Ligand binder design. Structure first.
Ligand code: COA
Ligand code: COA
Ligand code: COA
Ligand code: TYD
Ligand code: TYD
Ligand code: TYD
Ligand code: CL
Lengths: 187, 185, 185
């Protein structure tokens, strides 16, 4: 394995880091100062966390995943997971041609769309997917592999495609299993 | 370039690693102990090889490619190649809502689907593709870029889309070139 | 941030490299002697530039992006930007079954398709996209996320899909702004 030690970790300088947080040494963490991580979290190789990013507990950010929180930030609630090679954007430039583009160029010439991105509890994003700014992913939502998400998504559904369409209900058993797991944790 | 010396290879300790095997120091190899590698194989920057993976000979695995063989294994026969940024999964979690998810939770609470992934000879996988567990990709199968493969695939066909659909037969002239090529050695 | 200093850049040995140039140390650069960079370029972690590549000025190459310039080359012009996880190939292997495949194999048995690739001014390439060889992406072209490009694209259009299709005109307003920005300089 490739993860930082508890020793190495406290030395990163996160706004917050819980316990049993496993982080690849091969990930990239920009501005840990604005990054909070709960407990039981895994962040694999070649991830990039940048800007404002909050992660709860029980979350795997699989390899190659980029979270660009910029300023408004990205929030994951507990039991959210993100599969490989996913990108989440809290800010994006305007593609229309009404705006010059990117970090090379002064702000006034651009027309950056920005907006908090939220992943609620039990959201799972499949591999190679893309989430855009200002998007709340509803509790329980499953998004398929190679998905593109530009708009908010209603609780407890499964979505696929570019851009995603609602294809079926997500089952809630998962909520019973969460309840059980916490109780095994209990007494 | 960015490859191991033949020297340093030996110091990784694969189940087995043949000759003329170029593997980027920028790859991530986990649990080399269950990975074997034949001859004339290139693995490029930022690849990941995890768990049980078996690569024959004359195979390129291109940059960013993730092979997660876990316990059941991925296996690739000779002259099989994978283009950049592919993921081969020998194990996936249940997305239905019937299970809790990922490596952060106990296995009683989950419903991991698992099953060996094999790519037969002369298989080519296009870039940005995803092969899920329990899939035999038949000999001479070509899968297009940006494709997703959840079921086994018939021999000598070209497949594309998400999930893939069969679009036409692959030419087999490469059988000849294999023969003619092995010949001259 | 993971960038080289003005200093270390000079040691890399780029054909040419201008000012305000930030390249990630996490990037891989092969054969930097055929690679050339204007001014006010940014190249992010995990990018790969390989063989012949030429970038003008005011361009961002975002993270994970692979540019395989080969011998023919890839050229971007001023104000072209490329989003994350893109790949641009100036050379590719033939999938049809008429040839054997990849770098593990002698040229005489392959059937490499190759040709210069060009991104004209103001091109924007969407995240997770692929550009095949021998194409010109028209001036002012935007190509959506997760799109695949196999042919030259007409100027001032937005294209999406796999492979792309034209969906609407790109506003030419950016020309005004390019002037206004450059005037102000
Ligand atoms: C989304 C997913 C869970 C749905 O699978 P399913 O519930 O078994 O449903 P089906 O395969 O029958 O597909 C239903 C429909 O959506 C389409 N579809 C399925 N997955 C799709 C995807 N990823 N993108 C686009 N369309 C998809 C199918 O073509 C089918 O279409 P139709 O009914 O119009 O013919 C699964 O296909 C998937 O993408 N899983 C992602 C796995 C992953 O990323 N894992 C990381 C490892 S833990
Ligand atoms: C698979 C591939 C070879 C097929 O293309 P081809 O044999 O030239 O055939 P065509 O381009 O005429 O395509 C036939 C149909 O498939 C579709 N198609 C082709 N490639 C597709 C892909 N990757 N995904 C979805 N559809 C695809 C076309 O839209 C066309 O559709 P239609 O029948 O509805 O019109 C090619 O497009 C591809 O994906 N190559 C991948 C190369 C790669 O990843 N290289 C790595 C560097 S070596
Ligand atoms: C291409 C893009 C600009 C178009 O957005 P838009 O101008 O708002 O257009 P719409 O969302 O109305 O969609 C227009 C049509 O294109 C389709 N479409 C949009 N984006 C698509 C994509 N990336 N791939 C395939 N189809 C797409 C829509 O389904 C719609 O189809 P219809 O007219 O048949 O219903 C945007 O969808 C996109 O892909 N942006 C990429 C952003 C990125 O990669 N950013 C990097 C960080 S700065
Ligand atoms: C994928 C990955 C694995 N590893 C290590 C830690 C794991 O114990 C081991 C197995 O990899 P992985 O495929 O994540 O296995 P699992 O699904 O069993 O957790 O390899 C890393 O250090 N970094 C990574 O990015
Ligand atoms: C792509 C890549 C190339 N290289 C080096 C070794 C290759 O011989 C050289 C050129 O590779 P590449 O650009 O892929 O060219 P080709 O397709 O002809 O093999 O750069 C690496 O070390 N690591 C890599 O991940
Ligand atoms: C993505 C990325 C960021 N960084 C650093 C430099 C940036 O100033 C910072 C975050 O940049 P970014 O998230 O791209 O946004 P902005 O356009 O607001 O700068 O982190 C790197 O060094 N390499 C990278 O690949
Ligand atoms: Cl990637």
């Amino acid at each position: 394995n490739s993860f930082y030690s508890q020793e190495e970790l406290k030395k990163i300088g996160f706004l917050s880091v819980g316990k049993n947080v496993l982080i690849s040494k091969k990930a990239s963490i920009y501005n840990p100062g604005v990054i909070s991580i709960g407990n039981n979290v895994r962040i694999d190789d070649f991830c990039i966390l940048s800007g404002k990013v909050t992660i709860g507990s029980y979350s795997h950010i699989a390899a190659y995943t980029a979270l660009y929180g910029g300023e408004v930030g990205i929030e994951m609630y507990d039991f959210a997971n993100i599969s490989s090679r996913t990108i989440v954007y809290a800010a994006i430039n305007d593609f229309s041609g009404n705006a010059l583009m990117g970090p090379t160029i002064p702000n006034q010439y651009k027309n950056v769309k920005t907006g908090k991105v939220i992943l609620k509890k039990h959201v799972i994003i499949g591999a190679h997917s893309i989430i855009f700014p200002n998007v709340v992913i509803g509790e329980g939502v499953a998004v398929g592999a190679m998905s593109m998400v530009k708009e908010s998504l209603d609780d407890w559904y499964i979505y696929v495609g570019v851009p995603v369409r609602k294809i079926k209900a997500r089952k809630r058993k998962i909520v019973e299993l969460e309840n059980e797991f916490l109780k095994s944790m209990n007494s």
